[PDB]
RNA sequence: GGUUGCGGCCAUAUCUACCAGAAAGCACCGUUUCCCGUCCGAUCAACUGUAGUUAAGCUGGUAAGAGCCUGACCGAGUAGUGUAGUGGGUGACCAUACGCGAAACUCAGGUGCUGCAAUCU
RNA sequence: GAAGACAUUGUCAGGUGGGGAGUUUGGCUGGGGCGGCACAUCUGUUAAACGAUAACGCAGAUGUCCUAAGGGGGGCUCAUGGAGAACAGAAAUCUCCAGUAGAACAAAAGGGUAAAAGCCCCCUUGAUUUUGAUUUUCAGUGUGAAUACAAACCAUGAAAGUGUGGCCUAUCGAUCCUUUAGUCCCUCGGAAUUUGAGGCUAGAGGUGCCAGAAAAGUUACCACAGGGAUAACUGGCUUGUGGCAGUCAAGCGUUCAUAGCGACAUUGCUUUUUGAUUCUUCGAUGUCGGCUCUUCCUAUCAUACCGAAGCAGAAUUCGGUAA
RNA sequence: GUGAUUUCUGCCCAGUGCUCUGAAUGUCAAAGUGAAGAAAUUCAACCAAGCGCGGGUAAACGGCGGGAGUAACUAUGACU
RNA sequence: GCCCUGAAAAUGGAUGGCGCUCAAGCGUGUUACCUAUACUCUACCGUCAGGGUUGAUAUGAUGCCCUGACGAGUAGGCAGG
RNA sequence: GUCGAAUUUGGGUAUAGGGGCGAAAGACUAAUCGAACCAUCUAGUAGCUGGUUCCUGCCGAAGUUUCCCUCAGGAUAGCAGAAGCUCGUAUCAGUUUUAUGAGGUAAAGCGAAUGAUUAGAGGUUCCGGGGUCGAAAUGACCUUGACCUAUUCUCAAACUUUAAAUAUGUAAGAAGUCCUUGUUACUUAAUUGAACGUGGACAUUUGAAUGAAGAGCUUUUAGUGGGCCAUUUUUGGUAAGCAGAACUGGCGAUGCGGGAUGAACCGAACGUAGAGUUAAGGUGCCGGAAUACACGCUCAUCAGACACCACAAAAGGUGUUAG
């Protein structure tokens, strides 16, 4: 038996996180050995039944999709139990925790009538997206994802330093001090001549003056997704603030 | 990457034929503009029964476009195109680089 | 159904049936690739020495 | 995956030397190349511009073109049952004369002198080379020279 | 563990531990010098070798088992301070097992050639018959066919028995602690007087 | 023959340690108005060859020196290797036949040669 | 009687629509699936001292980054060690001597580099225009990359000179369709003007299955052309493994190496295990087990005669001839 | 749909379906209306159903776990 | 060195069989002898190449004649029948 | 099993093919059902199996390169035949010698760099950590460790100063050499160079060896693109009549003498015959040919008898023979 775990992302973030949580509940009790790979790691389970216990652990914490195959070794004649060698192929959804993700049109109008240009907040069993301009959330089960798989537009490496000047709140809040207009300016164009950006963000409560936040700076990127090309360009924000520090 | 807004390169406009100052802007695609020839053909062929008659490309693998610049001369106003390599971040103008900093 | 991928056996005996023969030479080789500053002068040098033997020696 | 780059398998062949690193000496630049000079190719590893492909290490060609920092060299190369005529453009650090051609020019000047001098006397030009001949008979002397008898040795180990 | 008949002949290229290998089992043999290993060269004149005669591979553990059996014979007969054994052969070649296609590292092996010395013992002249039977009981542990040759040289020094005495009779031999340094004519003349006071006299 | 300028091959020319250097040449050296350049006339610039020295530089000599370099019936026709056998051996591998042939080691010697122009008891 | 300019029917237009129709559901591969990319590429090695060379061989890289990390000139020397200076220590700043690269050069590895190709300053656009010749993979086609010139216009430097992107080896893409720049030229064919449309020359929008289709499952109800090119059974080669037998002796056997046992090592046999391989059969060799019956083998449980013992007898253990 | 009788038929409206005496303008075709143009056209506003939001729905499809701390110690079919 | 022990497999069997013991065995040396479609010489066929020949041969110069070498073959190509 | 009822059954009549009917099996629908029977479109298509008709003469292959949703298939280059054309010692060559280049394998090296590795010794402390004299020291005095100097044992496919053999580049003269001096828009301070010439000189030893059933050039087109074996060099594998490569020879396509027997080994390549002599192997008999000659060894209650090849080991013998 083998639970082949794969994720198609070069920068592993969720793949690091699964190694920490596999040890907390300590699901690795029945591993004969642990091998790794290019884009994941492989496990070895002395009986068939120890592997099905593990997939039911992975179903609760991370979006997966699995299927099985087998092969013959012995072909025993008397009993009939021909001692096959099973294999389980697990694939994770390639969206990371703070990706910039442009939704397709049919999927965006199905859930919440949300705008297509969202972030990600809860990387857990369902993937939760969040519109940073106007706060509204929606969940995406893996059964809805793999029937039409898309990609993430950006990743956690295209983030730029930003320096907050003030926090101008509008007042409406979901649970986390929503829709604060933030006057922000990059670390690069701070000392040189004055260039100021002004944007809404969900980061209203934990944000104060003189602080460093990270965010996507859309105005200088030439993306090449067709979902991004099928938008209305003069509605796209310039900056999407992601996190503090 | 970063390119400046003012670039001095060769002009070919029947009066200059020499290096003059150019302005640098970024290339934008342009509208699809139906009543073109392939569109009036494709508008005829879809009509009727039979459904989709042309292939629709799905398996896309790139993540960047090449950056194209259009260089407009300031004297004779004769534009010229000039391409660059693939890059994920293209802004022009700001952040002239300084090496010695904290 | 695997197959034999690559070999160079019997490829030398096939080449030595018709011969590995030279391009074998020419007088007055072609001036494709020569410095074009040289070819532009070399045109006029032959035209003068043809005119020189034409009028003087007959 | 397989790899067939422009300088593959050239780890040792383009190394410089032992105790000959650094800039090149100036007699390389002062040598003069005319059209038709037989030149050998030996790729210098320091000068990257104008550099022959890894096939042409050691081959020998004819100069047909002379330009600013470079020469043109024709090389016969086999593929299949056929010799092609392939032209290169090498910078002058990578090129050098073949002395075997220059020693032929020195042998021609001797052949003109042997013919002209022996025409005045008037017999027996004798101009060709000859391979080495089996040697003559000769009488060897034992005077002050006794033949020293030898024998095969017994076996010793000394390990 | 596979029997050593599988791993007997030198087939593959030498495959040593390096930064490309990164993982080996530990060597079975660790200690190479036995007996009184702080003894001058003027003490034990007679040297006995064990020369191999077939081009083979000795495992690291066949070197270990023979090293003990040659030891425990010689100490019980002539005492543990009457000999000096030195294993001339170091194992470095890594053997691969295909434990069910590339092999995982399995054990270390030696690369023994014809004429190569495996063991070497230097003793007294009177303590000769104990040593030859001592290496004889180490011969059953190795594969192949080995033979014992008495050395014509003084101990481990690459000089013969009469040749060492005439250089030792002049003040040309000084003892570094386990081995002899020699005088050379070529070199500086002052520093050959700090060393060797008995010569030039 | 000494020196200077310009080089060629790039250790027989470098490296460590002492000693000697007539004549001229180099060099150290002396000043800060200008030209220029520095945190600093130290480096660089400029002015004087005057006030001073061969102490260093530099060339040369010594060392049973270190390195390098040519050699050799020095090791060695050894290790290797092409070709041939219904040759040996259970195999591993080794012999012979026709040919080619190292490196280390050992010993003996060596310690820059030269081109163009100038100038010197 | 109810109904009434509504419904109804006719045509076009959005929504819904496995109730139904049509099709598709990659390749390599120690069977096929899962994985992997050996499917485009790069360095070192395998590779057997020119070149060429394979496997799901080994150790690793790539889909980027850069108006400076590009181009030219000028200054200057680094890694590290030693000896010194308030706070100051193993690590801050300052100084001196040694310092052939042991540093750095955007990145994988391998080349290369010392009055530079490194570090620090000054000025910049050659990362530009016009098309040809050549090298590498190669059919001497494409695409990618590169080298050497010519005609122009420029950068830098006192000047020689170098510069047609990154010190060199990888970093990327056809027809059709859309689009922009260029000459502001050619055509819309009864004749003109203005709009629109079509052309020429040079770019971009992309095919990663990378010489480039637009594409989900299941069949234990199954079908046809075929394959022993290829699996499930016997035979064959092999012996890791399984089974069996030797040698050598450290030690156990209350005090003694071998009565009986035998650590650490080492040489073998066997084909009743199980693996490996795909040679024979897929126009079929009826594929478990038992019942029934004959013969063969010895590596001997019993019976015959013997040898040894830590064999007093009894009972037992070890070994020989012997099927 | 389940399958005589006796006896019971627990909790869950989130997903997917179904459904409604629910709010109003996010999406929003043809026809029609307004503006620019000499006109082909172009551009904007308006904009039915359905979707989306909100409510109901398990004898509809189906689902029924984990983690901590409670006056040393202890952690439940307790409690938070 | 030879030889013996080491040395155990299933139908009855294999230095090819018989059999061999100062060999009809192993090591080795000298001569004689046996025979392939191979080599040497001659005849015969054919193919190929180099040649001679106007007199007729009432004919064939698509013929007659001279000299020399060569001959395997599936797939396939051409030629005379 | 059931036998008075959801019973059995005649005749009439209704339901027809993507349709019927079904107390539900994908059952039945004229011996046909996971979609009938009959005719036509139809000689449907196939990269997949089977067959493919007369003789002789002559020449005679391929399983390899690049590309393809390509791997049971084609295009393309290769090998092959045919038809020839221009010419007839042209100048060529699976070869060697002379001269001259190029390379980093075999070996070698570690008191040579990088990287592993053994043993003691000589040193060094304002400066690793432990005892002692110690109020303490940047004191003295032991031990354990680090470094350091001179030695020592052993190594390397991805280490190297050095560096073979075998292979491989070119040259060995007519288009060549030398003297005189014309041309130009290139080049030079300069009729200085450059490149091409005019005119004269220099011939059979006109520039090493051997061979040349001719040399050069073109057009067109068949089959093939499943290969396998042996020696030496080699990769994965414990190993394989296993998998994957390098140079040459071979079988496939090919008989004949020999290995009893066999696609591949050893001899040797073939028109029909006669005579002669041999190759590889053989000469007790089957069997053509010496129960020849000569010097020794071995006696086996499993002898031994011929390469590829059809097997045997470590270890022991006062069996015997020579050292």
Swiss-Prot record, chain A:
Protein function: Acts as an adapter for the XPO1/CRM1-mediated export of the 60S ribosomal subunit. Unlikely to play a significant role in nonsense-mediated mRNA decay (NMD).
Note: Present with 11900 molecules/cell in log phase SD medium.
Transmembrane segments: none
Quaternary structure and partners: Associates with the 60S ribosomal subunit.
Subcellular location: Cytoplasm; Nucleus, Nucleoplasm
Protein name per UniProt: 60S ribosomal export protein NMD3
Family, similarity comment: Belongs to the NMD3 family.
Superkingdom of the source species: Eukaryota
Swiss-Prot record, chain B:
Other facts noted in the record for this chain: Present with 13600 molecules/cell in log phase SD medium.
Subunit structure: Component of the large ribosomal subunit (LSU). Mature yeast ribosomes consist of a small (40S) and a large (60S) subunit. The 40S small subunit contains 1 molecule of ribosomal RNA (18S rRNA) and 33 different proteins (encoded by 57 genes). The large 60S subunit contains 3 rRNA molecules (25S, 5.8S and 5S rRNA) and 46 different proteins (encoded by 81 genes).
Assigned GO CC terms: cytosol; cytosolic large ribosomal subunit
UniProt-recorded name of the protein: Large ribosomal subunit protein eL42A
Residue positions where N6-methyllysine is found in the record: 39, 54
Intracellular or extracellular location(s): Cytoplasm
Keyword DNA damage assigned: no
Keyword field: Antibiotic resistance, Cycloheximide resistance, Cytoplasm, Methylation, Ribonucleoprotein, Ribosomal protein
One annotated GO biological process: cytoplasmic translation
Post-translational modification: In wild-type cells, 78% of L42 is monomethylated at both Lys-39 and Lys-54, and 22% are a mixture of species with either residue monomethylated.
SUPFAM superfamilies: Zn-binding ribosomal proteins
GO molecular function: structural constituent of ribosome
Pfam families: Ribosomal_L44 (PF00935)
Effect of residue 55 to Q: Confers resistance to cycloheximide, an inhibitor of polypeptide elongation
Ribonucleoprotein found in the keyword field: yes
Family: Belongs to the eukaryotic ribosomal protein eL42 family.
UniProtKB/Swiss-Prot annotation, chain C:
Gene Ontology BP terms: cytoplasmic translation
Localization in the cell: Cytoplasm
Chief localisation class: cytoplasm
Cross-referenced Pfam families: Ribosomal_L29e (PF01779)
A cellular component annotation (GO) from this entry: cytosol
Similarity-based family: Belongs to the eukaryotic ribosomal protein eL29 family.
Protein name: Large ribosomal subunit protein eL29
The species this protein was found in: Saccharomyces cerevisiae (strain ATCC 204508 / S288c) (Baker's yeast)
Organism classification: Eukaryota, Fungi, Dikarya, Ascomycota, Saccharomycotina
Swiss-Prot record, chain E:
Residues with PTM Phosphoserine: 126, 188
Residue stretches of each Sequence repeat: 150-164, 183-199
Keyword field contains Ribosomal protein: yes
Subcellular compartments: Cytoplasm
Keywords carried by this UniProt record: Cytoplasm, Isopeptide bond, Phosphoprotein, Repeat, Ribonucleoprotein, Ribosomal protein, Ubl conjugation
Subunit and interaction comment: Component of the large ribosomal subunit (LSU). Mature yeast ribosomes consist of a small (40S) and a large (60S) subunit. The 40S small subunit contains 1 molecule of ribosomal RNA (18S rRNA) and 33 different proteins (encoded by 57 genes). The large 60S subunit contains 3 rRNA molecules (25S, 5.8S and 5S rRNA) and 46 different proteins (encoded by 81 genes).
Keyword Magnesium: no
Alphabetized Pfam families for the sequence: Ribosomal_L16
Consequence of changing residue 177 to D: In QSR1-1; synthetic lethal
Leader sequence segment: none
Subcellular location, principal: cytoplasm
Designated name of the protein: Large ribosomal subunit protein uL16
PANTHER family in the cross-refs: 60S RIBOSOMAL PROTEIN L10
Biological process terms in GO annotation: cytoplasmic translation; ribosomal large subunit assembly; translation; translational termination
Function: Component of the ribosome, a large ribonucleoprotein complex responsible for the synthesis of proteins in the cell. The small ribosomal subunit (SSU) binds messenger RNAs (mRNAs) and translates the encoded message by selecting cognate aminoacyl-transfer RNA (tRNA) molecules. The large subunit (LSU) contains the ribosomal catalytic site termed the peptidyl transferase center (PTC), which catalyzes the formation of peptide bonds, thereby polymerizing the amino acids delivered by tRNAs into a polypeptide chain.
